């Protein structure tokens with residue numbers, strides 16, 4: 001029991017292409033999304049690992 | 056050091072010579088005078104700046120390591136990444152440092168060569184109207200004005216003017 005739970009939720013993802021249709025169908029256990037994340041600004045960014053804060 | 060002017064036959068520097076890197080000191084009647092050469096010091100400035108600009112212009116590529124994260128099931132991949140980053144790192148360290156060491160040598164040698172070349176310019180200009188003492192100074196066999204002096208420092212010296220005069224005072 002992690003976090004007081006013996007059950008799990010296993011998430012997976014995808015990049016939905018422009019003008020393509022995604023299809024969800026399930027007879028149970030589907031944690032469906034309500035949102036999708038459109039890519040509004042592509043650009044060379046990064047993820048920095050720090051414990052600090054932005055000044 | 057390699058051309059043996061600096062810390063060589065010209066044993067030490069001139070703390071009063073501060074209008075340039077190299078130059079003259081004439082001690083006639085009219086006065087004394089630490090007075091920097093123009094041509095040689097300029098050319099030496101142009102060379103060096105050209106050099107360091109050619110050093111900062113050589114290690115300027117990009118961009119990021121893009122920084123990647125790996126599973127507890129892809130530890131060869133993670134290490135391959137690591138091995139290739141450290142790898143390049145070491146290469147660019149060596150390259151930067153060796154370049155530094157080498158261009159430092161060549162720089163000091165360049166000043167040395169510069170000075171010697173100057174002293175050789177003056178010596179072969181004067182010829183035998185003087186005593187090559189070998190402290191890097193010359194002793195005249197005639198009277199040299201703030202006018203004959205300031206004619207040597209700009210490349211113009213009528214040898215056969217003072218030829219007979221100096222031949223006389225020599226003997």
Ligand SMILES: *[C@@H]1O[C@H](CO)[C@@H](O[C@@H]2O[C@H](CO)[C@@H](O)[C@H](O)[C@H]2NC(C)=O)[C@H](O)[C@H]1NC(C)=O
Nearest residue numbers: 015016017018019020021022023024025036038
């Ligand atoms: C899903 O939606 C998109 C956008 O409406 C559809 O793309 C269009 O398809 C029609 C007919 O196939 C074409 O006339 C248009 O040219 C398409 N739009 C553009 C701008 O490319 C797509 O066909 C739809 N697919 C489904 C599953 O109905």
